[PDB]
Structures are given as C-alpha cells and as structure tokens.
Amino acid sequence: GSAVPFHGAHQAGIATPVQDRLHFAAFDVTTEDRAAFVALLKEWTAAARRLTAGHAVGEGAYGGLPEAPPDDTGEALGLKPSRLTLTIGFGPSLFTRFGLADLRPEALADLPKFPGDNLDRARSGGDLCVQACADDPQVAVHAIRNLARIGFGKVVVRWSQLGFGKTSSTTPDKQTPRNLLGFKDGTRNIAGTEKDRLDRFVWAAEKDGTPWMTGGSYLVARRIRMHIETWDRASLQEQEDVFGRDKGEGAPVGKAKERDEPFLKAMKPDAHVRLAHPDSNGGATLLRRGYSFTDGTDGLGRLDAGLFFLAYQRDIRTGFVPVQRNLATDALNEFIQHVGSAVFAVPPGVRDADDWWGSTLF
C-alpha cells in the first residue's frame, strides 16, 4: 500500500521492487512548440508527485465548479498509493524535434533486425514513454489516463501495453515470479540493493559521453508472443533443456536450489540461460523488469499470451544488443516471436520539488 518516493538522483521504477501491475504507454508528440512541450513536462511532473503519493491531480476529483470537468478523473479516489512509480523515457524520434538532434545519446542506439523478428510498426517506437507500475491496476490506469488527458493537444497515445503480472525481480530475498511458460523468471538479475552493479551496468555515468543523461538509464521494450500451443505439447525434459534450469525449483541443471550458481557446461549449448549469461557475453549484464500479458484470443481458438520484456542498461550497445545477438541460436526461439520493439532514454531523477522531468535535456 505504501508510497515509493518520487524524488531522487534516479527515477523510481527501475531499481525499485517490482510491483504487481504494469501500464506502459508510448506517446507521440504533436506540438512543434518547444515551450509548450516544456510546459507539459512540468505539468506532468506536478501530476506525478500527486499521483505517486495517492493524491488527486490538480484541484481534485470533485468539489470544484459544477460547470467544469473535474481536474482528476476520480477512479483512484479512496485508494492507497499502492507503490505507484511513474518512469518517463524519450525515444530516438523525439530528437528530430525542438532542436534536439545533437543531444541524442550515442547509447540510445537503434536496434538491428534480429532473425525471427516480426515487428508491428504500430506497436513499436514512440517519441516518449511512461511506465506506470503499481500493485493496483486501477491506480496504474488512472495515472496513465490522467497524464494523457493533461497532454491533450501536445501528445497522443501511440500504443499501450498492460501487464497483468510481473515476470521479473529486483528483490532476491522474495519469491521469484513465474512467466506463462511456468518457469521462474528473475533469479539472476540485478537487485535494487546492489549499488555497485547498478553503477556498472544500469546507470549512465558522466564519462559515458552524454552529460544530460548522467544518472539515467536506457530501456529496451520487446513485446514477445509465446506459442503456448507448441510449448504445452513439449515434454518436461524438452522444457527444462530449453532453459537449463529445472521447472519445479528453478535450479541450474544438476544443482538442487534456485540460487545455486549455474554450471554452464552442464547445459545444452543452445540453452537460454547458457546463451544469456554474462559469462557467455563478455560480462554484459541487464536489469530485467518485464511483465506477462494476455490480450484475449488469437481468433484460432486459443488464448493469446506473451511477455512484455523490459530491460534497463547503461548502454544499449553493450547490454541488450550483444545478449540478444547471442540468442540467435536459442532453443527458446521455437516458442516465441518478437512482435513489438522500442528504445528509450530514461533521464535522471527529479531531484526535488522544483525540478521536472527532462530538465537536464531542456
């Protein structure tokens, strides 16, 4: 139920304990007026400080002038903050606007085409994103809906994705959640307590080349459909061999406990864990923060199921790209398809009550 502090050197919703629910929206910018966009960033930041404390935006949800629309849409009245975090990111396409071309970080790389990609252009890209995570889905929807309303005329929602349940962990002391393939997902991540690893692998440093990004991060989002029909007819041995961990405990093959260290040479050469492990990728390490989704049926008599994969890293070129390139031969490829993609530069934190989202860029 508790609030997560909004202010800091970093944005919340990265290193923060992973909340149960996601509402992710990508927006395109429709104004060419730099001042109007800056004004929106400040208004959004004011709104975020209310939302993340469990207060209504503006003058509230009722008790205003009868003849005016309420400032807050009202559907979160009476609810707790529910660990709401709101994390903003800027897409490569933003930097074609407002005279920003030379401020595009080098670490904000366009992804190459990967084998098996089938990206829907409508559900890819975006000038900016707001990741809303909370333990209560209504708290999350309310936040996105109110930001979008505030931004009417200046931004439009390009695409959105709801995540019903987490498939990631930044808290190794708590139970690791399972994805819809039935495997624990997040055992070997970066914990929010591992300050050293976060500095090394997640946060952008001044020396990395883009001063406005110091204390920020870079985000890859991949919408991945799961072929659950195909998977569910696979044997238990096939499923475990795909990953290199057992299904029940989620231990590395041959070992007894989830958190025992993998012995990679005992795994199949195309096992997912073997291919994705930092030791297989010159040390490349990622903060995974994904969620599961289901968007109805596929119209062929089956449930639609997927994973909305979210990875944070210090540089896309040294994080997600080398790892996913190594997954070219992954056994898991038989059971998944990447159907949406976007990258974002996640700026530094809102330092105090006088700061605002994007202040270091603008």
Which positions from 95 through 154 interact with a copy of itself, judged by CB under 8 A? 122, 135-138, 141, 144-145, 148-149
Using CB under 8 A as the binding rule, the residues of this chain from 209 to 238 that contact a copy of itself are: 228-229, 232-237
Using CB under 6 A as the binding rule, the residues of this chain from 264 to 323 that contact ligand HEM are: 272-273, 276-278, 286, 306-307, 309, 320, 323
Provide the token pair at 149.
Answer: 């309303």
Q: Is 55 annotated as a binding residue?
A: no
Contact predicate 160/181, CB 8 Å: no
Contact predicate 318/67, CB 8 Å: no
Strands (E), the chain: 21-29, 85-90, 128-134, 155-163, 165-166, 217-226, 287-288, 291-293, 306-313, 336-346
Partner touching 192 among ligand HEM, a copy of itself, none, CB below 5 to 8 Å by kind: none
d(CA 182, CA 203): 31
Q: Is 188 annotated as a binding residue?
A: yes
Nearer to a copy of itself (CB atom), residue 142 or residue 314: 142
Using CB under 8 A as the binding rule, the residues of this chain from 65 to 84 that contact a copy of itself are: 65-70, 73-80, 82
Binding mask 283-312 for a copy of itself (x = CB under 8 A): ---------x-xxxx-x-xxx-x-------
d(CA 22, CA 166): 8
Provide the token pair at 147.
Answer: 């930001």
Contact predicate 234/247, CB 8 Å: no
DSSP, collapsed to helix, strand or coil, labels residue 60 as coil
Is 246 a binding residue for ligand HEM by CB under 6 A? The answer is: no
The radius of gyration of the chain's CA atoms, rounded to the nearest angstrom, is 21
Partner touching 324 among ligand HEM, a copy of itself, none, CB below 5 to 8 Å by kind: ligand HEM
Return the HEC string of 258-324.
CCCCCCHHHCCCCCHHHHHCHHHCCCCCCEECCEEECCCECCCCCECCEEEEEEEECCHHHCHHHHH
Q: Is 259 annotated as a binding residue?
A: no
Partner touching 65 among a copy of itself, ligand HEM, none, CB below 5 to 8 Å by kind: a copy of itself
Binding mask 225-244 for ligand HEM (x = CB under 6 A): -x----------------x-
Is 14 a binding residue for ligand HEM by CB under 6 A? The answer is: no
Q: Is 186 annotated as a binding residue?
A: yes
Partner touching 305 among ligand HEM, a copy of itself, none, CB below 5 to 8 Å by kind: a copy of itself
Least Å distance, CB 193 to ligand HEM, is: 16
Nearer to a copy of itself (CB atom), residue 73 or residue 337: 73
Least Å distance, CB 150 to ligand HEM, is: 23
End-to-end CA distance of the chain: 34
Partner touching 273 among ligand HEM, a copy of itself, none, CB below 5 to 8 Å by kind: ligand HEM
d(CA 346, CA 121): 22
Contact predicate 139/84, CB 8 Å: yes
Using CB under 6 A as the binding rule, the residues of this chain from 175 to 234 that contact ligand HEM are: 179, 181, 183-189, 222, 224, 226
Q: Which residues of this protein are in contact with ligand HEM, per CB under 6 A?
A: 179, 181, 183-189, 222, 224, 226, 243, 245, 262, 272-273, 276-278, 286, 306-307, 309, 320, 323-324, 327, 336
